[PDB]
Design an enzyme around this catalytic site. Structure first.
Site, PDB file in Angstrom:
ATOM      1  N   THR B  52     -55.216  -5.940  22.721  1.00 13.04           N
ATOM      2  CA  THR B  52     -54.014  -5.135  23.264  1.00 13.04           C
ATOM      3  C   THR B  52     -52.890  -6.005  22.496  1.00 13.04           C
ATOM      4  O   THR B  52     -52.036  -5.287  21.898  1.00 13.04           O
ATOM      5  CB  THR B  52     -53.535  -4.844  24.502  1.00 13.04           C
ATOM      6  OG1 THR B  52     -54.761  -3.864  25.269  1.00 13.04           O
ATOM      7  CG2 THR B  52     -52.255  -4.243  24.511  1.00 13.04           C
ATOM      8  N   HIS B 248     -82.065 -23.478  24.112  1.00 18.50           N
ATOM      9  CA  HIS B 248     -82.300 -22.190  23.577  1.00 18.50           C
ATOM     10  C   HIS B 248     -81.636 -22.214  22.016  1.00 18.50           C
ATOM     11  O   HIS B 248     -82.428 -21.709  21.227  1.00 18.50           O
ATOM     12  CB  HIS B 248     -81.695 -21.230  24.527  1.00 18.50           C
ATOM     13  CG  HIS B 248     -81.977 -19.728  24.201  1.00 18.50           C
ATOM     14  ND1 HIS B 248     -83.019 -19.010  24.690  1.00 18.50           N
ATOM     15  CD2 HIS B 248     -81.417 -19.007  23.196  1.00 18.50           C
ATOM     16  CE1 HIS B 248     -82.837 -17.849  24.197  1.00 18.50           C
ATOM     17  NE2 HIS B 248     -82.046 -17.836  23.138  1.00 18.50           N
ATOM     18  N   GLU B 249     -80.477 -22.760  21.756  1.00 17.35           N
ATOM     19  CA  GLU B 249     -79.811 -22.301  20.669  1.00 17.35           C
ATOM     20  C   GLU B 249     -80.398 -23.511  19.442  1.00 17.35           C
ATOM     21  O   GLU B 249     -80.819 -23.035  18.333  1.00 17.35           O
ATOM     22  CB  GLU B 249     -78.555 -22.872  20.420  1.00 17.35           C
ATOM     23  CG  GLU B 249     -77.682 -21.930  21.305  1.00 17.35           C
ATOM     24  CD  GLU B 249     -78.110 -20.334  21.031  1.00 17.35           C
ATOM     25  OE1 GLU B 249     -78.183 -19.996  20.014  1.00 17.35           O
ATOM     26  OE2 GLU B 249     -78.068 -19.686  21.968  1.00 17.35           O
ATOM     27  N   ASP B 322     -84.336 -10.946  23.347  1.00 22.32           N
ATOM     28  CA  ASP B 322     -85.276 -11.455  22.218  1.00 22.32           C
ATOM     29  C   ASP B 322     -86.748 -10.727  22.243  1.00 22.32           C
ATOM     30  O   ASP B 322     -87.265 -10.122  21.323  1.00 22.32           O
ATOM     31  CB  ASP B 322     -85.417 -12.577  22.122  1.00 22.32           C
ATOM     32  CG  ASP B 322     -84.142 -13.507  21.595  1.00 22.32           C
ATOM     33  OD1 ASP B 322     -83.069 -12.904  21.239  1.00 22.32           O
ATOM     34  OD2 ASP B 322     -83.733 -14.531  21.713  1.00 22.32           O
TER      35      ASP B 322
HETATM   36  N1  LIG Z   1     -55.449 -15.346  21.945  1.00 27.37           N
HETATM   37  C1  LIG Z   1     -54.489 -15.327  22.890  1.00 27.37           C
HETATM   38  N2  LIG Z   1     -53.484 -15.755  22.818  1.00 27.37           N
HETATM   39  C2  LIG Z   1     -52.628 -15.748  23.799  1.00 27.37           C
HETATM   40  N3  LIG Z   1     -52.892 -15.012  24.837  1.00 27.37           N
HETATM   41  C3  LIG Z   1     -53.803 -14.273  24.841  1.00 27.37           C
HETATM   42  C4  LIG Z   1     -54.800 -14.329  24.049  1.00 27.37           C
HETATM   43  N4  LIG Z   1     -55.822 -13.488  24.357  1.00 27.37           N
HETATM   44  C5  LIG Z   1     -55.522 -12.937  25.400  1.00 27.37           C
HETATM   45  N5  LIG Z   1     -54.121 -13.573  25.767  1.00 27.37           N
HETATM   46  C6  LIG Z   1     -53.429 -13.019  27.150  1.00 27.37           C
HETATM   47  O1  LIG Z   1     -54.280 -11.930  27.842  1.00 27.37           O
HETATM   48  C7  LIG Z   1     -53.424 -11.212  28.556  1.00 27.37           C
HETATM   49  C8  LIG Z   1     -54.069  -9.893  28.695  1.00 27.37           C
HETATM   50  O2  LIG Z   1     -54.914  -9.861  27.760  1.00 27.37           O
HETATM   51  P1  LIG Z   1     -54.861  -8.466  26.546  1.00 27.37           P
HETATM   52  O3  LIG Z   1     -54.547  -7.164  27.288  1.00 27.37           O
HETATM   53  O4  LIG Z   1     -53.913  -8.692  25.453  1.00 27.37           O
HETATM   54  O5  LIG Z   1     -56.490  -8.539  25.915  1.00 27.37           O
HETATM   55  P2  LIG Z   1     -57.482  -7.009  26.213  1.00 27.37           P
HETATM   56  O6  LIG Z   1     -58.803  -7.696  25.485  1.00 27.37           O
HETATM   57  O7  LIG Z   1     -56.963  -5.814  25.520  1.00 27.37           O
HETATM   58  O8  LIG Z   1     -57.775  -6.882  27.814  1.00 27.37           O
HETATM   59  P3  LIG Z   1     -58.206  -5.886  28.728  1.00 27.37           P
HETATM   60  O9  LIG Z   1     -59.564  -5.413  28.550  1.00 27.37           O
HETATM   61  O10 LIG Z   1     -57.857  -6.617  29.999  1.00 27.37           O
HETATM   62  O11 LIG Z   1     -57.256  -4.738  28.469  1.00 27.37           O
HETATM   63  C9  LIG Z   1     -52.188 -11.373  27.808  1.00 27.37           C
HETATM   64  O12 LIG Z   1     -51.116 -11.303  28.487  1.00 27.37           O
HETATM   65  C10 LIG Z   1     -52.119 -12.615  26.596  1.00 27.37           C
HETATM   66  O13 LIG Z   1     -51.165 -13.311  27.282  1.00 27.37           O
HETATM   67 MG   LIG Z   2     -54.888  -4.580  28.486  1.00 28.79          MG
HETATM   68 ZN   LIG Z   3     -82.537 -16.225  21.434  1.00 32.94          ZN
END
Ligand SMILES: Nc1ncnc2c1ncn2[C@@H]1O[C@H](COP(=O)(O)OP(=O)(O)OP(=O)(O)O)[C@@H](O)[C@H]1O
Ligand SMILES: [Mg+2]
Ligand SMILES: [Zn+2]
Ligand SMILES: Nc1ncnc2c1ncn2[C@@H]1O[C@H](COP(=O)(O)OP(=O)(O)OP(=O)(O)O)[C@@H](O)[C@H]1O
Ligand SMILES: [Mg+2]
Ligand SMILES: [Zn+2]
Lengths: 391, 391
Positions: B52, B248-249, B322
């Site tokens: 998001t 494993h890796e 696997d």
């Molecule tokens: N790479 C990043 N840098 C900074 N903040 C991050 C990062 N990844 C996630 N966050 C933090 O994650 C919080 C929520 O995650 P976000 O909703 O953006 O991700 P998502 O994958 O869409 O999550 P969800 O499945 O829970 O909706 C945000 O407030 C952000 O601060």
């Molecule tokens: Mg979210």
């Molecule tokens: Zn494997």
């Protein structure tokens, strides 16, 4: 007005609530560094353990107003609106809701969600609630920003029960032969509400004879009056029930110490202590899924049930909960490590494995139970030493 | 408003999204040479990895409106109609749908397909969606002209975790003894959402004591609070689990380097990186089918499972995936190169072949695991050199 000096046997809960007291005394110390406080806190525990008394002690440690309402008295939307309006006019304050599971009929619930989203946390406002049925709450209440912190309140142990008796006898004249430590050892299973009612019964016995002091015989006669009759209030664990419980707890500890992947043991007791032991899931655990560690976990989870069958040929309701959790774990194993016929045989093999350990180590099992029946609880420093001589 | 400066550890994903930013700033530069842009883009990854947040950063790098809706809130057809009407009135804009797998009950799906076909791409309009369950999506959504581009978002590595900690501490006062690089090395398995919650916990510890700076001891005490208790939020890899993963890796890399037809190795790590390693098929590979190259591919695919059995006598859930892929490959081999009895023996022979290689090269296997346990990742330039001294 009450403070933390009126509460006994709740050391861990009081430790978590110290942060709330500092916040209510001076919010600006949290705002100037960007520390963000939760909006709602949930207290969960059996009835009579003092959840309403803990909330009032927080509002006394910090001199702030205390607005409250009971969820069993439910015009409903208008009352919720009035309650939150009063709290805003006085910046640092507390809002308390009792029996929240009763109210959370749909118009009242919607108003509460609107009010939770519409107040500013930086003003020094916080909401608290209490319940003993946490597993029937609406999932909307537990989403982030509404009720995201939970605290567990447990029944007291022997040293906790002695502290509660002292609190409620500090304004009463006692004879010189009264020994509150002996009285505590004779009431396993009592909670703080039961202990407060027991002191009133012993005073009625003395007053009916015209005496001006409460003797040791009054306390012993009051125990029999509150556990039997057309007017009974309390339950206690009998010596026969105590023996069956001790064997169940020691069966878990013996099996864990023998399997290579078993977890360390830190405490054994007759009174339940955790949220799992109290029968709560809390709407809730390893990064890696392995075959050897999942099988050792299943065998140790059936150690209490195996000791009951080898020593008594019986089965309790706690052992039935254990067998239900084991089936859920085995079901998830089949769908991840490579249907109903397969799940049934996995659980059967683990049960047979645990019974062989109980038979082969029957001597160590008996020695642990004898110590437990006299102390009622073994702690880390002493438990670690004790487990060394055995095995 | 957010931009690409608020995102850490997503270099490859940000590289693919640069084209979308140029298109939204000036569509005419694409139209004048006949370059045709996709209509929908799909972001797939585990929860909390920032899907998001990446979409909102695209709409900030180019000053365009951002219309959004959540698929978990599902009148449904009327809401979809309103959303697309607003986006048309403002030519260059973005439409975002969250939890698309929840909504893609049949009347709402039909309206979305109608809306996708009925807007002009040359106006500068594009649709984005996110999910973490890509394998249950309706096949109608993925046909050409609807959702034909996919981007993978991965969990961060050690250098990625350090960048996220810096982003969220640039408005907070820190003591001089804080070392964010040491904190990063102690949280393998965390995602960006976990790391953002950890910074808030360390600030609450300082505020409750009245201090005005966050010290190194606050950060270390916050790690223990978020991974255990009635209120836990995060999982991390323990030192015991780390050792099993490393073996494993390294089993895959050793077997590939020995078989004549094996593919080159470019990277080894403790954190998963690809879409195959994350457990996705994506609804999806050589022109020629040969016997010698298919047998070398089967042997290398069983190298991780063979190292677990020769060193620990165990089996994990990754090794079970696997063995399932291997059976599918062998089944297709029998029907093309010349039934269930035949498939079973092909897989058994390849498994025996891999175990002999692991035994004969046990010394090189141990040397690689030791380096991995301290660096956590070996890259192409260093990996190529390292593999030379061994073997
Ligand atoms: N790479 C990043 N840098 C900074 N903040 C991050 C990062 N990844 C996630 N966050 C933090 O994650 C919080 C929520 O995650 P976000 O909703 O953006 O991700 P998502 O994958 O869409 O999550 P969800 O499945 O829970 O909706 C945000 O407030 C952000 O601060
Ligand atoms: Mg979210
Ligand atoms: Zn494997
Ligand atoms: N730890 C304690 N110390 C002293 N008194 C206690 C304690 N726990 C409970 N009590 C007594 O319990 C009585 C009633 O219990 P209280 O209402 O505080 O608890 P509760 O868990 O909210 O109960 P309920 O579910 O019945 O409302 C109070 O008068 C208080 O005297
Ligand atoms: Mg009450
Ligand atoms: Zn049990």
């Amino acid at each position: 007005r009450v403070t933390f000096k009126d509460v006994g046997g709740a050391e861990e809960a009081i430790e978590e609530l110290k942060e709330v007291v500092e916040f209510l005394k001076d919010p600006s110390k949290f705002n100037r560094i960007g520390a963000r406080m939760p909006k709602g806190i949930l207290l969960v525990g059996p009835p009579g353990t003092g959840k309403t008394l803990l909330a009032r002690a927080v509002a006394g440690e910090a001199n702030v107003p205390f607005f409250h309402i009971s969820g069993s008295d439910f015009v409903g939307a208008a009352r919720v609106r009035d309650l939150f309006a009063q709290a805003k006019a006085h910046a640092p304050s507390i809002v308390f809701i009792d029996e929240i599971d009763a109210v959370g009929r749909e118009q009242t619930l919607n108003q509460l969600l609107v009010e939770m989203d519409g107040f500013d946390s930086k003003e020094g406002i916080i909401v608290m609630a209490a319940t003993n049925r946490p597993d029937i709450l609406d999932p909307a209440l537990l989403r982030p920003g509404r009720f995201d912190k939970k605290i567990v309140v447990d029944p007291p142990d022997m040293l906790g029960r002695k502290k509660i008796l002292e609190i409620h006898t500090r304004n009463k004249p006692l004879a010189e032969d009264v020994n509150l430590e002996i009285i505590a050892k004779r009431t396993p299973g009592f909670v703080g509400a039961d202990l407060e009612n027991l002191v009133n019964e012993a005073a009625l016995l003395a007053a009916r004879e015209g005496r001006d002091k409460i003797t040791m015989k009054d306390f012993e006669e009051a125990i029999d009056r509150v556990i039997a009759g057309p007017a009974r209030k309390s339950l206690l664990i009998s010596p026969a029930e105590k023996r069956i419980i001790a064997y169940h707890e020691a069966g878990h500890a013996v099996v864990s110490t023998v399997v290579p992947n078993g977890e360390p043991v830190h405490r054994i007791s007759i009174i339940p202590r955790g949220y799992k032991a109290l029968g709560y899931t809390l709407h809730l655990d390893k990064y890696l899924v392995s075959r050897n560690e999942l099988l050792d976990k299943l065998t140790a989870l059936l150690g209490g049930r195996a000791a009951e069958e080898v020593v008594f040929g019986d089965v309790t309701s706690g052992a039935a909960n254990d067998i239900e959790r084991a089936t859920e774990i085995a079901r998830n194993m089949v769908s991840q490590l490579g249907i109903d016929e397969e799940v049934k045989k996995i659980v059967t093999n683990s049960y047979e494995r645990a019974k062989e350990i109980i038979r082969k180590y029957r001597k160590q099992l008996d020695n642990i139970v004898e110590i437990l029946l006299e102390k009622e609880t073994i702690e880390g420093d002493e438990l670690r030493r004790i487990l060394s001589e055995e095995f």
